[PDB]
Design an enzyme around this catalytic site. Structure first.
Site, mmCIF file in Angstrom:
data_model
loop_
_atom_site.group_PDB
_atom_site.id
_atom_site.type_symbol
_atom_site.label_atom_id
_atom_site.label_comp_id
_atom_site.label_asym_id
_atom_site.label_seq_id
_atom_site.Cartn_x
_atom_site.Cartn_y
_atom_site.Cartn_z
ATOM 1 N N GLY A 87 0.789 -1.243 0.000
ATOM 2 C CA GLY A 87 0.000 0.000 0.000
ATOM 3 C C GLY A 87 0.820 1.291 0.000
ATOM 4 N N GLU A 127 0.415 5.588 7.590
ATOM 5 C CA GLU A 127 1.767 6.111 7.357
ATOM 6 C C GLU A 127 2.045 7.356 8.190
ATOM 7 O OE1 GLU A 127 3.303 3.821 6.115
ATOM 8 O OE2 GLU A 127 1.725 2.862 4.939
HETATM 9 MG MG LIG Z 1 4.309 -0.549 5.621
HETATM 10 ZN ZN LIG Z 2 3.186 0.282 8.780
#
Ligand SMILES: [Mg+2]
Ligand SMILES: [Zn+2]
Ligand SMILES: [Mg+2]
Length: 889
Positions: free
Chosen positions: A265, A302
């Site tokens: 991702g 993130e």
């Molecule tokens: Mg990651």
């Molecule tokens: Zn992560």
């Protein structure tokens, strides 16, 4: 192959204090010059200096500006650079090197690579060694000063970590940028980007320090308009960390960059987050509804790493769950808060109990902190992430919000530096536990077993009610099955959130209670219980376990209708379905085994069907929750409860059950499909890029679920609705129109129509590919061949490959075709993919994870394909290790 062991951790005999990089990108090659300012650590015992360096072409290496001679002073075997100790200085020294790499032909998408017209790095876990020489491990903290040069017209936008401190012109149409990043970091958080990137930007002003933060979101020019939602999600993420955790962003700028070719991702490089385009870009016109929660989740995730991963680092890769489980937990808390729907939590539980439970009962079963690895890339699992997150979430359940926030802050304050282990987090939480229990004799030593013990605990119940005493007892038992990791399993610290429901009026009989199960079994007694209750067990799914409620279906129906807790309602429904599935499965199987000319099936409980109708018709009830109740449990959840699962027998079981319920409820489904149209498909805010309504998207989910149920049933004239649905502006609708048309002669008409709608947007075409792949077609093998020849071709884009093949593997009847043709097809794709991208080849193995859970014939067919894959002369280390563990070799 080298096996790395957790108990073998030792600090390095070297120190890297400063990295000075010059990355010079040319048409046919990239030149990387690196000066490492190094030292000898206290743990040094006179050993050789060994750097990690994979596939590097050495032009020259030096110590203190003196060129080193190959063979005499050093050897390089394309994996390790060994400089013999007699040539290694005994105090502070400079190591320098110039190597050549080739991002253009780096199709493994690790190290430095080209994605379309963008040069981009991916260094986690062990990809920095693919760029230059390093002691490539997370405990080697260094300062970075990075210069990037490239052709100005091809690569006008240059990004790395830290502050851009210089920009300059270079003769021959080139240009450079220097980035200095003084705070210490591990090399896996190094990142570089070069491309013709367009952006949207905003300013965020932090809550407490009032620091202005520059927010930039980047993509190729074609897709720049799809960036707005990501920008809004980033703002939301920053606000959440501030509001819930009191945590502010510490840097003056945050960059988010979308790339087309990406193994996962996204990636949390400090100040320079890099994303799979499918987890960053969206528009109402060109994306399905799912893109909206996916972007929110991944952008959130993130962002949350900036503290849990980046500001607090890992000592070693065995600690992965300390950053990953903790950040998924923070991500899930964020999403629950942003979406305001009960289905957010339900979807996380749905993932764990299907995908992760399968993993934990398979030959690949490992604890969330494994004892060993061969390949770090195979380490980023649903266990480490999703069971890790449930383990991280149990701290909050046990402590409550106030004391959890205290222990978390304790952890951040004591370790903001700085490397940490899982024990460091447990220690922090234990201090809060001491404070909460009001005695410093309280500990969480038993809690550590959640980190070291593999397998899913089974939690079972028995009850007693004494009407004259008004006394209610819950007797609880826990059991984990022995596996290849532990002969003896120990009792875990299991928090059980409970309510007691009065079956006469549906009311709560007691306050919020969390039972602390710390033994193999215990009896919890409640006084002043006026009537025999129905127990509401494991509210919010309070521990990652198999729940065996031992409730009657009448008790479950009443929880389903009346309980306050979304998960227990959903689980009660799940349990009713499972009992039915198991009964009908065995009836079908007996008939098949005994070759019966005639036989009986047990009908679906009538009062259950009545309860479903009741909930669907309740206007105050959640549309997302409604779509779960009309859907049977996932196949990968079911398989955990059946030995030697015959997939045709299961497909027959599901089919019978769906038909039983549809025969009663189809008119209700049709009426709801029609009445939900106005609100579900409301276009008021279609051209508002930042207006996102999770309730409305759940109403579309419900409509699309119902349309599917009605199309399967061949409800009268439903093809008229399918055709109309194809004219919707929402991709979730018109792509649903394609899949549900599978049962009609109009399928290929909608195939062509929706293809034309999807073909000029890269991400939308991938969603189209998934829809075709998942289509319930008898000619699905011919269709996949058509996709290969006409759309996919020799694409090395992981999104394209995964879109064509993975959804098809969920086709119970067809992928598990008894000839093994589906197993053969997937194995060919894995082997082909393994030649250029071992990580994605391993991802494509996911279908085979349940191999030993199927009927004897299918076990044998899958095993044959895996042994064939294992026999491939060119097999990668990544694929080889995975299949060897999976096949118990
Ligand atoms: Mg990651
Ligand atoms: Zn992560
Ligand atoms: Mg090379």
């Amino acid at each position: 192959p080298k096996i790395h062991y957790r108990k073998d951790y030792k600090p390095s005999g070297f120190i890297i204090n400063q990295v000075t990089l010059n990355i010079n990108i040319h048409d046919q090659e990239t030149i990387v010059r690196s000066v490492l300012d190094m030292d000898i650590s206290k743990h040094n015992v006179g050993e050789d200096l060994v750097f990690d360096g994979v596939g590097l072409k050495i032009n020259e290496i030096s110590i203190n500006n003196k060129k080193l001679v190959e063979g005499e002073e050093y050897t390089y075997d394309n994996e390790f650079l060994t400089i013999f100790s007699k040539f290694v200085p005994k105090s502070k020294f400079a190591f320098s090197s110039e190597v050549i790499i080739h991002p253009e032909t780096n199709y493994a998408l690790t190290g430095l690579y080209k994605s379309k017209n963008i040069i981009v790095s991916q260094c986690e876990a062990t990809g920095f060694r693919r760029i230059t020489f390093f002691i490539d491990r997370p405990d080697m903290m260094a300062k970075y000063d990075v210069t990037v040069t490239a052709d100005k017209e091809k690569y006008p936008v240059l990004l790395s970590n830290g502050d851009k401190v210089n920009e300059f012109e270079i003769p021959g149409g080139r240009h450079g940028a220097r980035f200095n990043d003084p705070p210490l970091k591990p090399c896996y958080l190094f990142a570089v980007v070069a491309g013709d990137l367009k952006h949207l930007s905003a300013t965020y002003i932090t809550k407490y320090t009032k620091k202005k933060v520059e927010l930039y979101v980047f993509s190729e020019e074609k897709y720049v308009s799809k960036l707005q939602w990501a920008l809004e999600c980033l703002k939301k993420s920053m606000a959440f960390d501030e509001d819930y955790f009191g945590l502010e962003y510490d840097l003056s700028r945050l960059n988010l960059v979308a790339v087309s070719d990406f193994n996962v991702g996204a990636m949390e490089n400090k100040g320079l987050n890099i994303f799979n385009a499918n987890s960053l870009l969206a528009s109402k016109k060109n994306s399905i509804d799912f893109s909206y929660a996916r972007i929110l989740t991944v952008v959130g995730h993130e962002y949350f790493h900036q503290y849990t991963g980046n500001r607090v680092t890992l000592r070693d890769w065995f600690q992965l769950t300390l950053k990953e489980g903790l950040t998924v937990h923070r991500e899930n808390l964020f999403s629950e808060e942003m979406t305001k729907t009960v289905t957010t939590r339900l979807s996380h539980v749905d993932l764990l109990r299907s995908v992760q439970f399968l993993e934990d009962s398979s030959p690949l079963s490992h604890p969330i902190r494994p004892e060993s690895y061969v390949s770090m890339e195979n380490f980023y699992t649903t266990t480490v992430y999703d069971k890790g997150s449930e383990v991280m979430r149990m701290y909050l359940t046990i402590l409550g919000e106030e004391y959890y926030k205290k222990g978390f802050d304790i952890y951040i304050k004591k370790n903001d530096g700085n490397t940490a282990t899982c024990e460091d987090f447990n220690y922090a939480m234990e201090q809060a536990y001491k404070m909460k229990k009001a005695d410093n004799s309280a500990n969480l030593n038993q809690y550590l077993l959640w980190f070291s013990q593999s397998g899913t605990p089974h939690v079972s119940f028995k009850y007693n009610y004494d009407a004259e005493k008004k006394q209610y007892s819950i007797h609880v038992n826990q059991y984990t099955k022995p596996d290849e990791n532990q002969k003896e399993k120990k009792p875990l610290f299991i928090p059980i959130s409970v309510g007691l429901i009065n079956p006469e009026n549906g009311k709560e009989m007691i306050s919020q209670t969390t039972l602390e199960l710390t033994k193999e079994s215990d009896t919890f007694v409640f006084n002043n219980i006026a009537v025999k209750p129905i127990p509401s067990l494991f509210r919010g799914f309070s521990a990652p376990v198999y729940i065996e409620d031992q409730l009657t279906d009448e008790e479950r129906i009443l929880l389903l209708k009346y309980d306050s807790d979304a998960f227990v309602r959903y689980n009660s429904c799940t349990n009713i379905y499972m009992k039915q599935i198991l009964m009908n499965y065995n009836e079908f199987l007996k008939a098949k085994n005994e070759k019966l000319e005639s036989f009986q099936l047990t009908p679906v409980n009538a009062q259950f069907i009545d309860a479903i109708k009741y909930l669907l018709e309740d206007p105050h009830a959640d549309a997302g929750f409604k779509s779960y109740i009309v859907s049977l449990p996932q196949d990968r959840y079911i398989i955990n409860f059946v030995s030697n699962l015959d997939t045709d027998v299961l497909a027959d079981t599901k089919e019978y059950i769906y038909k039983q319920i549809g025969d009663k409820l189809n008119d209700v489904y049709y009426k709801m499909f029609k009445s939900l149209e106005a609100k579900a498909d409301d276009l008021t805010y279609f051209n508002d890029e930042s207006h996102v309504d999770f309730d409305q998207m759940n109403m579309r989910t419900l409509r699309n679920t119902l349309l599917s149920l009605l199309s399967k049933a061949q409800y009268p004239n439903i093809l008229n609705e399918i055709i109309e649905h194809s004219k919707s502006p929402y991709p979730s609708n018109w792509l649903t129109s394609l899949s549900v048309s599978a049962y009609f002669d109009k399928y290929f008409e909608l195939y062509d129509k929706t293809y034309k709608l999807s073909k000029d947007d890269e991400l939308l075409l991938q969603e189209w590919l998934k829809t075709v792949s998942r289509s319930d077609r008898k000619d699905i093998y011919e269709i996949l061949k058509k996709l290969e020849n006409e759309v996919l071709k020799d694409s090395k884009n992981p999104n394209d490959i995964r879109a064509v093949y993975l959804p098809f593997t969920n086709n119970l009847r067809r992928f598990h075709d008894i000839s093994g043709k589906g197993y053969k097809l997937i194995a060919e794709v894995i082997t082909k993919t393994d030649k250029f991208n071992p990580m994605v080849a391993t991802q494509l193995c996911e279908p085979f994870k349940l191999w030993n859970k199927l009927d004897t014939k299918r076990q044998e067919l899958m095993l044959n394909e895996m042994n064939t894959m294992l026999q491939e002369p060119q097999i990668s280390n990544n694929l080889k290790e995975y299949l060897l563990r999976l096949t118990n070799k």
